[PDB]
Amino acid sequence: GDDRELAILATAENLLEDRPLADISVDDLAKGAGISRPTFYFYFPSKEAVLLTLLDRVVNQADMALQTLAENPADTDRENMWRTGINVFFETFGSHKAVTRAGQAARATSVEVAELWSTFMQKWIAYTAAVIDAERDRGAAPRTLPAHELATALNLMNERTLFASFAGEQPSVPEARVLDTLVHIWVTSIYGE
Amino acid sequence: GDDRELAILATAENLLEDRPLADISVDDLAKGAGISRPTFYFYFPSKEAVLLTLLDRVVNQADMALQTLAENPADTDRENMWRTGINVFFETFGSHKAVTRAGQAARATSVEVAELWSTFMQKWIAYTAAVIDAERDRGAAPRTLPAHELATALNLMNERTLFASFAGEQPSVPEARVLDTLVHIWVTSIYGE
Numbered sequence: 001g002d003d004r005e006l007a008i009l010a011t012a013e014n015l016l017e018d019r020p021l022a023d024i025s026v027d028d029l030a031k032g033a034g035i036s037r038p039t040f041y042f043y044f045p046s047k048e049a050v051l052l053t054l055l056d057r058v059v060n061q062a063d064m065a066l067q068t069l070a071e072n073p074a075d076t077d078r079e080n081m082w083r084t085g086i087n088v089f090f091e092t093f094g095s096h097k098a099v100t101r102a103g104q105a106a107r108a109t110s111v112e113v114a115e116l117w118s119t120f121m122q123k124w125i126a127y128t129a130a131v132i133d134a135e136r137d138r139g140a141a142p143r144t145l146p147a148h149e150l151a152t153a154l155n156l157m158n159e160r161t162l163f164a165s166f167a168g169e170q171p172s173v174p175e176a177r178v179l180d181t182l183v184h185i186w187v188t189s190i191y192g193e
Numbered sequence: 194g195d196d197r198e199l200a201i202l203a204t205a206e207n208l209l210e211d212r213p214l215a216d217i218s219v220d221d222l223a224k225g226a227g228i229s230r231p232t233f234y235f236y237f238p239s240k241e242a243v244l245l246t247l248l249d250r251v252v253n254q255a256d257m258a259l260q261t262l263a264e265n266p267a268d269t270d271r272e273n274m275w276r277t278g279i280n281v282f283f284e285t286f287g288s289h290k291a292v293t294r295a296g297q298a299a300r301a302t303s304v305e306v307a308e309l310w311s312t313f314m315q316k317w318i319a320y321t322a323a324v325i326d327a328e329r330d331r332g333a334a335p336r337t338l339p340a341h342e343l344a345t346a347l348n349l350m351n352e353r354t355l356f357a358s359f360a361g362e363q364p365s366v367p368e369a370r371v372l373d374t375l376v377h378i379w380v381t382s383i384y385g386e
């Protein structure tokens with residue numbers, strides 16, 4: 001019943017390691033999930049709706065991990081705080097590289113994917129901005145750029161850079177270096193200046 | 194003779210303001226250029242080869258503008274120097290928004306587009322790294338991150354952010370604010386921490 005939907009999801013994720021969404025067929029997904037093609041369609045309209053659900057669970061998982069951080073303040077310096085937050089995305093998407101990579105490419109192609117990505121990027125920008133402002137009210141950060149324009153560019157940086165790394169793009173920051181790199185840039189641009 | 198190739202190029206660029214590459218047909222391009230469909234094919238294999246040539250001229254124009262800067266040192270502070278370099282890309286691609294935007298999307302789809310973008314991103318990263326290092330030998334910049342990993346992430350930032358703005362994406366930095374935003378981040382992350 002439910003367990004089948006989960007099987008279609010797990011099959012899709014497993015096949016996206018080895019190839020793109022284009023070379024995955026509804027029949028491939030049905031086979032893998034141990035159901036037939038017409039049973040597949042009872043659970044999802046398309047292969048693309050499978051991706052969307054997948055991306056949706058990943059992004060929500062990152063989002064939830066970030067709320068947990070926000071509610072339970074990790075006790076530390078400014079540098080470590082920021083690193084902990086960037087680490088949420090680096091870990092969460094880095095554990096779901098095929099879904100990430102495919103979810104990025106379907107932004108060009110799927111309006112729902114584009115808008116889901118958009119909703120969350122906005123949510124995460126807003127929270128980064130809310131935290132930069134909080135940091136400024138306290139006197140820890142100088143009032144340089146508008147907080148929200150700063151948050152925007154720094155979050156756009158992480159998206160490009162994190163996914164470039166994960167995909168192994170030329171050029172990219174090696175994955176083992178990406179986190180320190182992004183953090184140096186967040187911390188100097190937020191506190192400097 | 195040559196003037197026709199230029200007409201196909203100018204037609205393509207003009208039609209990409211109003212719609213995507215998908216909704217532009219070879220016949221559309223031929224019409225506009227005042228030639229027939231089989232004459233089109235004498236000059237280009239495909240519509241996609243038209244885009245490539247277009248992207249190639251833009252990217253080379255940015256590249257050339259950056260060399261001019263590099264050879265003739267503008268006399269100024271560290272902040273203005275960097276701003277002048279980022280301004281090359283903001284101006285050059287901002288004058289060619291449809292070609293940019295289309296050239297970004299065809300990266301997913303065209304290996305030649307992907308590799309052209311890749312060659313230049315590498316070239317521009319290398320030069321940013323060479324300049325960060327020069328700045329460090331002089332004692333103006335501290336030896337924090339590896340210069341080349343720093344250049345990489347900052348250049349990835351500009352790509353994402355500049356194009357997000359130009360496309361009017363949600364979310365993005367307003368185009369009238371994008372340059373100051375990127376510069377604050379370059380300068381604090383290069384000189385700070």
Ligand SMILES: O=C(CCCC(F)(F)F)N1CCC(c2nc(-c3nccs3)no2)CC1
Binds near residue numbers: 085090093124127128
């Ligand atoms: O890196 C992303 C989004 C990246 C999304 C993506 F797509 F993967 F590129 N950040 C969004 C939020 C930002 C952030 N941390 C925090 C906090 N940490 C600890 C306590 S409060 N508050 O805000 C961390 C960077």
Ligand SMILES: O=C(CCCC(F)(F)F)N1CCC(c2nc(-c3nccs3)no2)CC1
Binds near residue numbers: 279321
């Ligand atoms: O912004 C880009 C590439 C962006 C590419 C793109 F795709 F548009 F996002 N920069 C590459 C090079 C960097 C740079 N400036 C300079 C100099 N200025 C003055 C003298 S020497 N030396 O290096 C400027 C930022």
